[PDB]
Write a protein that binds this ligand. Structure first.
Ligand SMILES: *[C@@H]1O[C@H](CO)[C@@H](O)[C@H](O)[C@H]1NC(C)=O
Ligand code: NA
Length: 663
């Protein structure tokens, strides 16, 4: 049986079970349960039908706390009924969420506060109190330290109640986060499934466990999130003998997803959206993990680096040809020029290269190494310096091609070492034109927050949303996770701070652009255990975030906070299209002339998204009939699957329609 209190707390009564307070003249299970709920310390109690007594820890019956979320779960909204509370003679009202805590630095902790009301009163008498916590077990009141200088998290915990002064957030300025979406496996890696008329599914994957990894295992846990309908499922992919944790990821011309190395460091898996199945690729010429791969102008996939797994040495380039179905080793694609200097040595130094497919089968490497390089696949491979981005390495910085037409790359954050490393606020616009000629680098305004292990996406208007990351790179921690998202506007070279997300998204988190021009932010954590099947019970679960949250940017909102009217792409052929061809589509529901941009479908892991890029379009209109001449350079318009967004003149985007660019 399950009893639900008047605020929504849940207890599970199992008649016939046994396992601080012992109350007699209790007639039933329900009564003992009501005793359990009275006591902030009570997770489990025993009803004794024989002696008619209730023990707060057959002849007996057990009572167990069983909320929809477990104790210690991060929340974005009160799980239970909230109350308002105004401090007498104050004209200052607070929301109170029972059975929850605010974790993080305290401005003050005060002993001998015996009621929630006295805790609210203390908050009212403390300058700059926006969040306080009442400790039901110890009779103490904590005032939380000021945000966003400090990061404060909202956790489900019966010991406490939270007290807050609501902040008015204008979504027309700051966007809006939805609530946490619980997932079966930590989304350490994710990709949009190509589909017509628009994608509806995000696949995501961890390792052999939903919240743990080891080494080679031959299995990956996947989740499948239909963001159209909210349906979620999971599967264990074993048929490719591939633990896909810590891989390279690239989308092929035909929208198949090439997942390369990681825990099974020499294994390759190909996801086919048409079948929803994985097939074995050919083994890589070199075993690799934590490498980046990029799809090229000719549909081949280049990769370099990957010392995380396989041999613990620098890894030269190689290239996959999906038509020959072959890997070729490229020793002339030398790892040495692209190394960082890391306190953990070569294991780290060749990891997570900022790689972009460009003109004539070239590769631009934008970082994270101080120096930028051109790589190529001709002969045995090529390498040359292109520019100096910065005076330090920015390992796991964010980076995105926000304007492929103008060769524009934005990068921000990262840390000089992979871990135990203060993150930078530095940001840069890199401009590329002719491959194997100098790049240009312009330092732009610093980020408002230092961020290691952040994520970034380009939006239809060319702005870049940076989500999560932490002030100091500390693998597998929540520590000083930034919750405030930042929007960088390349037109003004300005940052704006957005609404805060609920959960820190640091190491092993992702972000990715959804077809409604919202951003999924999720994941974080994972536990290392020595062997496949070992117990995770000794793992710090507070750093695991088997969930995500979706950000609506400012462009989705009118000045009054209502949802702005979106253009509708009412008709577009599902036929593939070549570079230089004319895309035509019908647009309804726009006042004045829409703009159009293509955004390549994303794939993401370890602060690496080598599949996304924005290709802005010029359109001409005859009535409701739009036409755009696609760039004729496959270095700009990479093959594969794209979102087509039509935006109002004020910058509100349509739901995307899928466009397939072919060779
Ligand atoms: C992958 O293929 C290569 C070439 O046959 C082989 O020698 C290697 O052992 C294979 N490795 C794995 C890890 O399957
Ligand atoms: Na370093």
């Amino acid at each position: 049986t399950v009893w639900e209190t008047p605020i929504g707390v849940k207890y599970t009564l199992c008649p016939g079970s046994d396992y601080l307070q012992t109350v007699r003249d209790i007639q039933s299970s329900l009564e003992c349960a009501k005793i359990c709920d009275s006591d902030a310390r009570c997770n489990r109690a025993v009803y004794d039908n024989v002696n008619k007594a209730c023990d707060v820890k057959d002849r007996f019956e057990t009572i167990r706390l069983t909320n929809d979320l477990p104790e210690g779960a991060f929340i974005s909204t009160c799980s239970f009924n909230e109350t308002s509370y105004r401090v007498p003679e104050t004209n200052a009202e607070y929301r109170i969420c029972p059975d929850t805590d605010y974790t993080g630095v305290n401005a003050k902790v005060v002993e001998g506060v015996t009621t929630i009301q006295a805790c609210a009163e203390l908050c009212s008498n403390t300058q700059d109190c926006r969040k306080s916590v009442f400790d039901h077990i110890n009779n103490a009141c904590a005032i939380k330290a000021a945000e966003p200088a400090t990061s404060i998290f909202w956790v489900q915990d019966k010991q406490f109640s939270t007290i807050r002064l609501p902040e008015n957030i204008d979504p027309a300025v700051k966007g809006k986060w939805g609530d946490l979406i619980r997932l079966p496996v930590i989304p350490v890696a994710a990709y949009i499934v190509p589909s017509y008329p628009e994608p509806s599914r995000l696949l995501f994957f961890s390792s052999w466990s939903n919240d743990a990894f080891s080494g080679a295992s031959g299995m990956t846990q996947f989740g499948d999130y239909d963001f159209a309908t909210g349906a979620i499922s999971q599967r264990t992919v074993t048929n490719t003998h591939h633990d896909m944790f810590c891989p390279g990821i690239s989308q092929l011309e035909d929208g198949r997803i090439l997942i390369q190395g990681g825990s099974d460091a020499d294994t390759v898996s190909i996801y086919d959206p048409a079948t929803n199945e994985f097939t074995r690729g050919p083994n890589m010429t070199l075993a690799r993990g934590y490498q980046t791969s990029c799809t090229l102008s000719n549909g081949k996939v280049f990769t370099i680096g990957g010392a995380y797994s396989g041999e613990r040495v620098g890894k030269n380039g190689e290239v996959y040809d999906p038509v020959a179905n072959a890997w070729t080793y490229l020793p002339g694609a030398d790892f040495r020029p692209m190394l960082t200097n890391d306190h953990e040595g070569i294991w780290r130094e060749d990891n997570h290269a900022w790689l972009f497919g460009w003109k004539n089968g070239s590769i631009f490497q934008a970082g994270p190494s101080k120096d930028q390089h051109w790589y190529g696949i001709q002969g045995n491979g090529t390498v040359a310096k292109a520019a100096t981005r910065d005076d330090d390495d920015a390992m796991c910085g964010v980076w995105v091609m926000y304007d492929a037409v103008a060769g524009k790359i934005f990068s921000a954050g990262g840390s000089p070492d992979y871990t135990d490393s203060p993150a930078t606020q530095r940001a840069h616009i890199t401009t590329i034109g002719e491959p194997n000629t100098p790049a240009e680098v312009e330092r732009v305004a610093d980020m408002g927050f230092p961020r290691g292990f952040a994520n970034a996406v380009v939006l239809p208007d060319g702005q870049v949303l940076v989500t999560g990351g932490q002030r100091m790179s500390l693998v597998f921690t929540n520590t000083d996770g930034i919750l405030v998202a930042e929007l960088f506007n390349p037109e003004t070279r300005e940052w704006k701070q957005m609404a805060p997300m609920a959960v820190p998204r640091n190491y092993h988190s992702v972000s990715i652009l959804l077809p409604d021009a919202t951003v999924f932010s999720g994941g974080g954590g994972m536990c290392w255990v020595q062997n496949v099947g070992d117990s995770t019970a000794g793992c710090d679960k507070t750093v695991d975030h088997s969930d995500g949250e979706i950000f609506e940017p400012p462009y989705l909102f009118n000045e009054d906070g209502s949802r702005a009217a979106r253009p509708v792409i009412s008709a577009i052929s599902a036929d593939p299209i070549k570079a230089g061809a004319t895309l035509t589509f019908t647009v309804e529901g726009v006042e004045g002339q829409g703009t159009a941009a293509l955004i390549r479908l994303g794939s993401v892991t370890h602060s690496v998204n080598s599949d996304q890029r924005r290709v802005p379009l010029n359109v001409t209109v005859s009535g409701n009939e739009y036409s755009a001449t696609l760039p004729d350079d496959y270095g700009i318009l990479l093959p594969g699957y794209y979102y087509l967004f039509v935006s109002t003149p004020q910058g509100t985007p349509s739901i995307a329609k899928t466009v397939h660019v072919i060779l």
